Design a protein around this ligand. Structure first.
Ligand SMILES: *[C][C]([O])[C]O[C][C][C][N]C(=O)C1=[C]C(C2=C3[C]=[C]C(=O)[C]C3=OC3=C2[C]=[C]C(=O)[C]3)=C(C([O])=O)[C]=[C]1
Ligand SMILES: *[C][C]([O])[C]O[C][C][C][N]C(=O)C1=[C]C(C2=C3[C]=[C]C(=O)[C]C3=OC3=C2[C]=[C]C(=O)[C]3)=C(C([O])=O)[C]=[C]1
Ligand SMILES: *[C][C]([O])[C]O[C][C][C][N]C(=O)C1=[C]C(C2=C3[C]=[C]C(=O)[C]C3=OC3=C2[C]=[C]C(=O)[C]3)=C(C([O])=O)[C]=[C]1
Ligand SMILES: *[C][C]([O])[C]O[C][C][C][N]C(=O)C1=[C]C(C2=C3[C]=[C]C(=O)[C]C3=OC3=C2[C]=[C]C(=O)[C]3)=C(C([O])=O)[C]=[C]1
Lengths: 433, 28, 433, 28, 433, 28, 433, 28
RNA sequence: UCUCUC
RNA sequence: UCUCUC
RNA sequence: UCUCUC
RNA sequence: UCUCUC
RNA sequence: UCUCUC
RNA sequence: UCUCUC
RNA sequence: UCUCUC
RNA sequence: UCUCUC
RNA sequence: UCUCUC
RNA sequence: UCUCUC
């Protein structure tokens, strides 16, 4: 590092203040919903609260709902399931809040500031949970992409309203999906790329293709994506080139940011415990999330005949965005063997409406890791016919044995300054296999 | 049967980044 | 799924608005033709109305007819048989409408919009009916294809003016037929693939071959079709390769979209009953068609010595595009055993002009199914000499016992959210055998 | 006598997708 | 409007006095050439007179001719064909006038004043006639420009000696042609843009590029032209940018002034009839030209096997500069369908020397319009890589259906104050197609 | 064959200003 | 045309003054070489004189020869064979002139001006003669190009020192040859495109590729050439693309300028006869060359057993650059059937040193044409994988029957103003076949 | 045997511009 | 298995 | 504005 | 490997 | 204010 | 080649 | 179709 | 003091 | 966004 | 200051 | 689409 330490501390202060805003907003909403400590630590209650906040600030959807009211749902109220424990058993109740009220509470929590960064953080946490839980092979096959490249679908469920953080965290496969959807839309109707809407669509196409270009690593991919962007009315050839680019990302990996976006319950508990994230600072890639997870208790609803350990592992991988990570390193860091998706005896965290909340129980989630490591936004050792041939040569030269991140290991929770790394010595390796 | 074929390295840890080479290169 | 829910709801709204347009157009045309409720629910009247709409918007045929007027038929009027019930007995009358009038009615129904999507929907319904009713083995033998691959003839009767929906729903056999017709046309006259028309013909050949490539599943077929496309003036070798590709599609099945395109009478009845497809939404592959069919009464003309149950089964398979589907699953879903084509005591739905409309009677069609299932655009478990040998090895490795769609079953009409599937336990299996 | 030889799976239902293997493979 | 009415009346008085000067000059020259009323109203005689006036005042050409005398043509005499009717048949005679005499007559007509504005008016009338008659695709291809952008060639034949009026009326394509000619001249000889002549050439380049910048509408084009101007020794890149700018002017139209410059015969007839343009005023864009054309008879020579209606339509479009205008609005305003150039059975108005003036006849021109409208200097609804991408986005967003000049219609000849507009309701649309 | 492709609006009249969009945008 | 007449007359005056300079230089050199009228009209003497002038002004070759003197040839003297007639028989003598003397004579002829335009004119005449005489299939095969595209080799022998005129007249095949030579040179030595010489070579590559881009007609070729230019260190793929571009130029013809550059003997005879090209003007594409050829007598040396008619036809096609022109139109214009190269019983015009100048005789050349026509710089009716497929579609759509230059015919020598064209009615059609 | 296959139109005269289509298109 | 789509 | 399972 | 995102 | 690993 | 500077 | 331009 | 729609 | 003020 | 249609 | 404005 260098004199950029001051810049590195201002960013820490800003992210700490956003975490403080999230936590104290959760505290205020828990007080306004009359939830006890146990219910306030429920992951489903936190998910519902977060979804209500995100729905309250959705400008486009709210405007459309206002202009086209839904069936029996007024466009000025939000809500979701609230799980409250009475006489030992759980019970769900649908709550309804004015969206102006939710926006006012959120603004008051952040000292009268909009703070869209906090909303983006909550959305990224939701996207990480969805990526760690569900496979969207249906959207892959519908768009023509191979369902085998599910490892490139990082941040696929993120809405467009996410800012630069959403673009940074979303993977190459999702960018290819968005571009291919635009290609198909232009193929269906030729009035696309033409007129006043043509300008806006071309601008959006330009911008998404530019940031996909910035996402790649090697020069050949970075030039083929530029060739794809240059075509004014792209057709099947550009779609095929994008397919090839996505396929090449499995070996020539692209740089995708990974951040530890925790559920709002953890931040609320930390703020209630007296932690000042504004003073101490925060970092989504450092020890700060791992340390916070170590000292926090979070409860979750367990469906009948389900394993709490599997659900805790799922929630942990969602928290650390380790859905597509190598299983060996995930198990090494966590200290408990991480079971692939096929052998997880658990369904999604969110509980459907058509469920009987009388055979359901709550289990404490073990969000503890034996070691901690720094999350990276980098790929690995990545060292129109001409570009395709060059890329095929590069992929053929690569092997699944080259060692990447040489000299970088895993640290202990006591090693806050990352002084002494532990290089692992190395079973299954794919989660979604 | 389809499934995950590559690995995306979220953690900065000395690794080998596995991928299923015969199936990926079979497409060309 | 993921944050693509909003995209999945916009598509639902758009298809609902197209269904609303179709239904209210049918209502308006019933009012302009002075048909009672019973006549308005007749399937033959709906077929005639739909054909008049499709003929009114046929640009190329109308232009040719205008430039080359037919014998006694002015090129500015459409029409068809209208069956009206008087004093108990049926009676047919040929009606004649100005094509400008029909286009104006259609545009007024869709709020001044052309809405070619609705016309494509009507054409796909007609194509499904034709596929479920008649075998075009004559066109198969005329083009040199084996009449045994009638299962790949999905969407063969679709006109070229159908957009991307027509290309998605039409089968691999029809694509091979179109390509082979182009090959034969180029073989007959060598001035093909040359000149100004040569450019257009090469462009069309490119596009049809590209979407046939996208239709296939395995890489070897996808590469052989690319090899076929590359030849500048294809001859007998390319035709033989296309024949082999079509033959390989019987074991290595291609991905063909299946949609439930209902007759316009059902949509008109739903719109008259007050259903708002724009608000509630629609989906051609979900429960929406099955639910709509359950609550709708449709009548049809029965020729003397014909079984209403067989005609109802034919109309049901036409509605759900189950012409080439396995008979066991069709009978399981419907709840009534589905009889193959050879043992159906019924002729086509459309009544010829040289028929006596005094021995004909009307029977209510039983368009009810015990269960409902999601229609799929996928194949099964599909897991130049070199490509041919590889494909032959793949087909030889496959057996007619491999279980596909593992874990996916059939739902009850009460299960609107598809929560609990019912995997069937398994007689004849081919309709056209 | 000719006839249908394969099955096209319109419904997404757990099935076995029958086809007449001896007659299809007899062509090669 | 506002207190600028006085300014708007002074301009009217000045243009009226220039029209009076033109008319009384034509009267004096008719008296000095001994032409009867019929010959004085001939359009060819007026063209010859106007050309003699313009040649008399051409300073540079006269100086060059004086220093380099031509072959058998002394540089102090002008002239042209004079068509006189004797014993029923027409006959041409070449007349010769001293240029000092013509200049003296012109100055005496304008009360001892040079009045270069009148000469510019005559030149603009000639340029409008040439634009409405002939296509200069040869100059387009010679300079490398696409011959498809003939709609931007307004005022291409105008000589450089035309003042600000010539620059205002000439189109974007002609400016691009002049700039490209300068670019080519500098590419051929590198001593261009260098020395004493380099200063003058750079000044001229600056000025023409500045007024081309002022001609455009949107900011992106206005910035790209500024980028083009900044290069000190422009090369092929600037020429390509100018080509792109001209191509973008077909969708993002530039503001080109349109004025009704009538032939001198009409002004002479009006002055003979007693009209005082000085007192009543005049306006090249208002009703004044349309009203004057309604009350004036003008005759023209018709070649054997030619249609007088087509020649009258050509002369009308030349008078109102409607050469590149939409055919539908031109036909609506005129009241008679306006036939495109390809189907006009007429050659140019000017009669060549190698023609037999014994099979030629004279026909009265129907310069009458059913309605009248205000000519506009505006474009439509127009609402280095970055600039090019922005312009391409703007053009792609635009459609050939956006309604421009909303609420502005066409007036009747009785409606002198333009109180009640008539918005037309809308066949071919391109003259030079 | 070449020809006029755009329209230059000399008259100030409510119009739509036609132009041949596929041919103009084909250059890019 | 339009007000660009003045510009069209200044160019005529400038080319007339260059023709006058050439002619009076030839007169002065004939006086300084003591040649009679018959010897002065010999085409071989004119060729020798022209070659001496071109060699005198060759800066680079003269500098290299000065720094590296040749074997027995001092680098400050030029010369060539001079054929003088004595006592009836011909005799050759090698003449030697100081190059400073030749440069001084040339400058004095052009009024103390360098006038490189005249030298370019002489070089273009030599190149046209070489193209009409010899086939460079050896240079085609050496560079890898197909020897079948000899029709694109227009202006292949032109030296690089020719200005914009040389680039305009040279064909697409020669540009592809130059680019391919550069590609091969860079492939051989990778230090190419790198360093101080790398800058110059890249600049030259840029410029030649840009003007090749300007030479093409359709947009697809114009975009593929741009794609070729963009590669920083082009290799085999760019060479293959250039080969494909050259092959596509046989159907999608490129715009190549054609000028009638006559031998200096004709200009000298015209200047001696009193013609003032400065006053009357000149044009290399109009009637001026055809008229001049009609009134001029030129003699040439005939080898034993050779046909004077064939040599005259060869010289005529060289003069009018009709080497690659359709034989039918050439025969129609000339009035005498034009025999292809294979059946011409004549060798090259230039006489080798190892020839016996005692069996050689002189024959008058019949440089007379029955009609005359305007030479055109245009192609015909021309109405990275994607670009290649589009171009292949365009070429396949084209046929060898489409009529180009519709409505444009051939004029008679009396029709100086091209008033009445004669469209020909249509045997062999290829000269080099 | 090789030879000229196309025509380059030096003169601006109504023509058909012959070329040997089977041999040119045989390369693709 | 071509009852018509050369 | 036609019609026909193979 | 498309159980729905035309 | 919905839901679902493939 | 991003072991932290959104 | 490379009778010379590596 | 010329002329030409493409 | 020039329906008139060159 | 050379020469050669393929 | 350059029937002449190098
Ligand atoms: C954290 C950090 O590092 C990050 O970095 C990277 C990122 C950057 N940023 C970016 O790129 C951005 C983007 C965006 C977008 C856009 C824009 C514009 C338009 O038009 C369109 C678009 O789209 C999109 C985006 C994002 C995402 C997605 O997905 C899509 C932005 C906004 O939007 O704003 C920003 C930034
Ligand atoms: C629903 C969805 O998913 C669908 O997807 C798939 C599809 C896509 N699309 C496509 O592909 C298309 C196609 C087409 C076509 C064409 C084009 C062009 C040309 O040239 C030709 C052609 O052909 C055809 C088609 C279709 C169908 C058929 O059959 C044939 C289109 C049009 O046409 O437009 C569109 C799209
Ligand atoms: C009517 C009114 O409105 C008008 O306005 C607009 C216009 C303004 N003006 C102007 O711009 C002008 C221009 C000119 C010119 C010039 C100048 C200088 C120099 O150097 C050069 C030039 O050039 C030119 C011109 C014009 C035209 C053309 O074309 C070219 C002027 C003069 O010249 O003077 C004036 C003004
Ligand atoms: C007559 C007229 O029209 C013509 O036009 C067209 C042409 C234009 N121009 C041009 O382009 C030019 C070119 C050149 C060149 C160059 C330059 C520079 C560099 O670096 C190189 C080069 O190369 C070349 C050329 C030419 C030819 C050849 O071959 C090669 C020039 C010079 O050089 O200077 C000028 C102009």
């Amino acid at each position: 590092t260098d004199g950029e330490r001051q810049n590195a501390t201002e960013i820490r202060a800003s992210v700490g203040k956003m975490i403080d805003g999230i936590g104290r907003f959760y505290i205020q909403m828990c007080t306004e919903l009359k939830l006890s400590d146990y219910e306030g630590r429920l992951i489903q209650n936190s998910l519902t609260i977060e979804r209500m906040v995100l729905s309250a600030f959705d400008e486009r959807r709210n405007k459309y709902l206002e202009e086209h009211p839904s069936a029996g749902k007024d466009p000025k109220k939000t809500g979701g399931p609230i799980y409250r424990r009475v006489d030992g058993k759980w019970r769900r109740e649908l709550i309804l809040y004015d969206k102006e009220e939710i926006r006012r509470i959120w603004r008051q929590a952040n000292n009268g500031d909009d703070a869209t960064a906090g909303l983006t953080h909550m959305m990224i946490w939701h996207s990480n949970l969805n990526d760690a839980t569900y496979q969207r092979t249906r959207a892959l096959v519908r768009t023509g992409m191979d369902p085998r490249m599910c490892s490139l679908m990082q941040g696929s469920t993120l809405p467009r309203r996410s800012g630069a953080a959403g673009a940074a965290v979303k993977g190459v496969g999702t960018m290819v999906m968005e571009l291919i959807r635009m290609i198909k839309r232009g193929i269906n109707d030729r009035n696309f790329w033409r007129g006043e809407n043509g300008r806006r669509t071309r601008i959006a196409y330009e911008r998404m293709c530019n940031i996909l270009k910035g996402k790649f690593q090697t020069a050949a991919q970075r030039t083929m994506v530029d060739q794809v962007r240059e075509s004014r009315n792209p057709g099947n050839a550009e779609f095929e080139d994008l397919i090839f680019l996505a396929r090449s990302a499995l070996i020539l990996r692209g740089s995708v940011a990974h951040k530890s976006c925790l559920p709002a319950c953890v931040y609320g508990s930390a703020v209630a415990s007296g932690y000042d994230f504004e003073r101490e600072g925060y970092s989504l890639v450092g020890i700060d999330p791992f340390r916070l997870l170590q000292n926090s208790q979070v409860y979750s609803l367990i469906r009948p005949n389900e394993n709490p350990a599997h659900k805790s592992q799922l929630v942990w991988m969602a928290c650390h965005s380790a859905a597509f990570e190598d299983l060996r390193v995930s198990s090494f860091i966590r200290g408990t063997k991480v079971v692939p998706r096929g052998k997880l005896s658990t369904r999604g965290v969110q509980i459907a409406s058509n469920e009987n909340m009388e055979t359901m129980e709550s289990s404490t989630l073990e969000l503890r890791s034996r070691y901690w490591a720094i999350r990276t936004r980098s790929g690995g050792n990545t060292n129109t016919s001409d570009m395709r041939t060059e890329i095929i040569r590069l992929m053929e030269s690569a092997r699944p044995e080259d060692v990447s991140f040489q000299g970088r290991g895993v640290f202990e929770l006591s090693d806050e300054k990352a002084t002494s790394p532990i290089v692992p010595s190395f079973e299954g390796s794919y989660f979604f296999g | 049967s389809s499934g995950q074929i590559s690995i995306q390295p979220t953690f900065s840890v000395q690794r080998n980044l596995p991928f299923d080479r015969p199936t990926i290169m079979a497409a060309f």
